[PDB]
Scaffold this active site. Structure first.
Site, mmCIF file in Angstrom:
data_model
loop_
_atom_site.group_PDB
_atom_site.id
_atom_site.type_symbol
_atom_site.label_atom_id
_atom_site.label_comp_id
_atom_site.label_asym_id
_atom_site.label_seq_id
_atom_site.Cartn_x
_atom_site.Cartn_y
_atom_site.Cartn_z
ATOM 1 N N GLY A 1 1.008 -1.168 -0.080
ATOM 2 C CA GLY A 1 -0.133 -0.029 0.243
ATOM 3 C C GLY A 1 0.937 1.155 -0.079
ATOM 4 N N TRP A 2 0.190 2.473 -0.155
ATOM 5 C CA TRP A 2 1.255 3.521 -0.298
ATOM 6 C C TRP A 2 1.779 4.011 1.003
ATOM 7 C CZ3 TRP A 2 3.408 6.155 -4.075
ATOM 8 C CH2 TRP A 2 4.279 7.592 -3.653
ATOM 9 N N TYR A 3 1.122 3.958 1.864
ATOM 10 C CA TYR A 3 1.584 4.361 3.327
ATOM 11 C C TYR A 3 3.055 3.691 3.747
ATOM 12 C CZ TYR A 3 1.664 5.509 8.397
ATOM 13 O OH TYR A 3 2.168 5.850 9.658
ATOM 14 N N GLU B 1 4.854 -0.029 -3.761
ATOM 15 C CA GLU B 1 4.914 1.109 -4.808
ATOM 16 C C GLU B 1 6.121 2.118 -4.718
ATOM 17 O OE1 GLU B 1 0.718 2.555 -3.080
ATOM 18 O OE2 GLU B 1 0.358 1.749 -5.424
ATOM 19 N N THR C 1 -5.253 1.676 -12.491
ATOM 20 C CA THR C 1 -5.484 2.604 -13.649
ATOM 21 C C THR C 1 -6.526 3.636 -13.029
ATOM 22 O OG1 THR C 1 -6.782 0.935 -14.254
ATOM 23 C CG2 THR C 1 -4.982 1.771 -15.677
ATOM 24 N N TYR C 2 -5.924 4.561 -11.913
ATOM 25 C CA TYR C 2 -6.697 5.724 -11.260
ATOM 26 C C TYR C 2 -5.262 6.386 -10.722
ATOM 27 C CZ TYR C 2 -6.574 1.857 -7.853
ATOM 28 O OH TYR C 2 -6.123 0.604 -7.105
ATOM 29 N N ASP C 3 -5.881 7.522 -10.036
ATOM 30 C CA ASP C 3 -4.986 8.636 -9.583
ATOM 31 C C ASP C 3 -3.998 9.093 -10.578
ATOM 32 O OD1 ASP C 3 -5.741 8.260 -6.921
ATOM 33 O OD2 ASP C 3 -3.900 7.115 -6.192
ATOM 34 N N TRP D 1 -10.392 -0.032 -6.189
ATOM 35 C CA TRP D 1 -9.915 0.541 -4.652
ATOM 36 C C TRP D 1 -10.954 1.534 -4.607
ATOM 37 C CZ3 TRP D 1 -6.299 -0.596 -1.421
ATOM 38 C CH2 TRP D 1 -6.271 0.297 -0.077
#
Lengths: 498, 497
Positions: free
Chosen positions: A95-97, A143, A212-214, A402
């Site tokens: 995850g990003w965090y 990521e 495919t978002y952000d 997501w």
């Protein structure tokens, strides 16, 4: 036919787990109880998010997690399998965090994949966690690894694959084999870090979940759709970072494969993956967002699209100015820059002055608040029709989203996805995919079948001259001849012979 | 350090067989033309050409009668009496023997294929050197294909090893045996081996760039064959180097290889300087002692950049010697080439030629209004700019093709020596003009720059500059969170600092 995958990430903060309740949305906004047997049948996978990698270089829950409450939340998800024999509850690591370059545990991801020993210890821990908590597979969302770290990453995925296949045989799980997936970048910038090795990365996977978002947000200068399916010539374009990936391709090959500047779209991300040799469409799962991103200080004239704005882009949101009119979720979470589809749907119902507009090129909705200069980019059941048709047309493995906790109470977004792929009374045969801009790049790994007169030594060609030689069709770039195609820098490989 | 002045000297096999110091009709330019004064103006004479035979060894042309050959090589080596720095090298190859369709092509390709063939070939090179009295080896294979480069390189490495050993055995520390190669001066042929320039040049004393033949009847429009800088009005070409197997990213390729570009002497020099491991001091700029002629040219700009009706075929297909006043052309049956010596006589024989000058390319040209002829050549004037460029760029020297084409007074050789060595020649005020310069930049010629050291943990915006591991890097897009060399978001743009 083959059923399309419907993979929903389910994200629940450590604090919500530790205080888990299914009767107080102010505490747990979207409890597992929202998922009825009916909704369980609409999913093929739920990726519980997120597990992490600790300093011991092993897969682990955040130490702050109350273990008892964790297994309970996880048991509520696995209980759903009682209503859908195809359903898998995977867990996602990253995850990003936790895993971004400057994340709280980034070093742990880089170090865990370094050696055969570390990879073995890490892979074993993933399988142990899976069995200990009752999960059905592993999703990795780092990521993102880069250049130097990619070979270890690949080796790590290959080791996890070996251990899972053995656990499947050992557990007699042949009817529902343990699975391994990863979430991959949708935008070219992060994708360029490991793009050159996509084939190796995808080989041990059941699926690669494309994020495919952000693709747009406060952190970029011009407002734009964060998940446009196709491009709009009126929208911003960006440098195609894949041109900088360590590919070993020539200038012509890079330029042909990576038009630039280009429109950051879902189609671009998908086509960039398909362009690579060894990446099967059936393994590609298209991601879609169940949330929107908002911008302030936008100019009027084009529904707030493609305009300058004054939105803070740093995390966390500095100001206490919650300008997303009607967004109480934003007040609770302290950020008017993002809202769940659930919240957005209520803002429309709130008679707050938002105009729900539609871009027929990008095939996506957007909100324009002419009064406070607000722009919101998001997706809904209508944009999902075009994305579901694209997934069918492009023979992709399915859809990912997501995240599940952001759908409305009736579960309309998930129901729409299931409907478009499986409802006998839904018919998109006449759905017009529009005239939005398609991604046009062609690579050395996706050459079209071509036909050309065999090469003839002693002939003078050049400038677009097409000939067949040793299995490929080649084209002259300059000068004239004394070179067999492939013998120098003069010939461009442009097609395959049959 | 004295600049090298390397004159190739070509004498065909027939001339070796009928060698005479006394008959311009038989041997147009015998060794006696090289007086002590001229011998002092040269640092190297590349006797041309020896070839590679079917036994895959260095050898004189089978049709060469040895007695004559040795007498000619001896007259040349005798000139060393007049200049203690002079080297009489021999060159292997050339266009006739070694081009892809040359009479001996196969032999060059087979000579470098294996260690045994290379060892045997490299040894034959030294044997021939010692046997005939030569001072070094020049290789002019035009050109090894890309697949043939590794063998070519390994071969130069072997010759260098043997030559270094021979220098010591012969007490030649004061004038060591040397190894050089003639290198392509245009991007098209250069692209065959460009990616491995550092390896090719390491075993060499010099790489002699053939910065001539950049224009010719084989191209669609007339052009200067050795323009120093570019003319916006002239033709431009595809930059073949952008397709070389360099392994560089799009930004790097684009910045180094603009396309199209002007095929000039400056472009070839810079293209070589752009590669890491290619020292300016080893680069020798070649200049032509002959001109190339075109017919059927349109007036308007002195015959420059015009369509023409000149056949490009190799042997001139005809007995139509249309180059007015050119007697050599009749003699050698080809009106498309003339020695500077011939051109000078064509100019003073008032045959209808106008000597014009292009101040962008810094080269002269002849225009024949009546018959529609155009000739591109070089002279003592164009040599002033080229000599100053050689000094400014810190190049090793000048090379020319070929000595036998100079006039009797030896004005072209004298000018070259004058510009580098005359105490009373001063080019400090020479203006190099506004001709187009090659705008590419590579790893081997980065501009000195300064920037804050890279700080791990810092996020950088697009366009930010930092110094890391001796180089200055710039980000290509925003929100960069990793280090240069370990993040494709960074571009090496400068050095030291």
């Amino acid at each position: 036919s083959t059923r399309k995958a419907v993979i929903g990430y389910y994200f629940i903060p450590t604090n919500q787990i530790n205080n888990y309740t299914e009767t107080d949305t102010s505490v747990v906004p979207f409890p597992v109880s929202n998922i009825t047997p009916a909704k369980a049948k609409q999913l093929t996978h739920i990726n519980f998010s997120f597990l992490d990698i600790n300093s011991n270089l092993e897969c682990a829950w955040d130490p702050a997690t109350n273990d008892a409450k964790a297994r309970d939340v996880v048991n509520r998800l696995t209980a759903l399998k009682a209503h859908n024999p195809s359903l898998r509850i995977m867990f996602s690591i990253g995850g990003w965090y936790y895993s971004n370059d400057l994340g709280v545990s980034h070093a742990n991801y880089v170090n865990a994949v370094k050696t055969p020993a570390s990879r073995a210890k890490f892979a074993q821990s993933c399988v142990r966690i899976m069995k200990d908590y009752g999960f059905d597979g592993v999703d990795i969302n780092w990521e993102y690894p880069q250049a130097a770290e990619v070979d270890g990453f690949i080796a790590a995925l290959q080791e996890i694959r070996t251990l899972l296949n053995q656990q499947t045989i050992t557990d007699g799980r042949q009817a529902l084999p343990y699975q391994l997936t990863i979430a991959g970048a949708g935008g070219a910038f992060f994708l360029s870090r490991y793009y050159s090795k996509l084939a190796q990365i995808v080989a041990p996977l059941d699926y690669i979940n494309l994020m495919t978002y952000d693709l747009a947000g406060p952190w970029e200068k011009v407002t734009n759709h964060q998940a446009a399916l196709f491009g709009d010539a009126a929208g911003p374009t960006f440098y195609n970072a894949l041109r900088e990936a360590n590919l070993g391709w020539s200038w012509e090959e890079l330029t042909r494969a990576f038009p630039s500047p280009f429109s950051l779209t879902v189609d671009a991300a998908v086509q960039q993956h398909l362009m690579m040799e060894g990446v099967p469409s059936a393994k590609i799962v298209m991601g879609v967002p169940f949330y929107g991103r908002a911008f302030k200080g936008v100019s009027g004239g084009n529904g707030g699209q493609y305009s300058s704005h004054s939105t803070p882009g740093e995390d966390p949101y500095p100001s206490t100015d919650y300008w997303l009119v009607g967004c109480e979720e934003c007040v609770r979470d302290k950020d008017p820059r993002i809202a769940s589809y659930r919240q957005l749907e209520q803002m429309l119902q709130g008679n707050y002055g938002y105009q729900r507009l539609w871009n027929d090129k990008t095939k996506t909705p957007y909100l324009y608040h002419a009064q406070n200069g607000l722009f919101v980019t998001y997706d809904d059941a209508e944009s999902f029709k075009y994305k579901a048709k694209y997934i069918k047309q492009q023979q992709l493995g399915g859809v990912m989203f997501w995240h599940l906790g952001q759908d409305n109470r009736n579960g309309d977004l998930l129901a729409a996805l299931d409907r478009y792929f499986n409802a006998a009374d839904y018919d998109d045969s006449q759905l017009d995919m529009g005239t939005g801009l398609r991604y046009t790049g062609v690579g050395p790994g996706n050459l079209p079948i071509m036909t050309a007169p065999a090469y003839v030594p002693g002939t003078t060609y050049a400038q677009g001259a097409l000939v067949s030689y040793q299995g490929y069709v080649w084209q002259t770039k300059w000068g004239y001849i004394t070179s067999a195609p492939g013998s120098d820098s003069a010939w461009l490989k442009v097609g395959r012979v049959r």
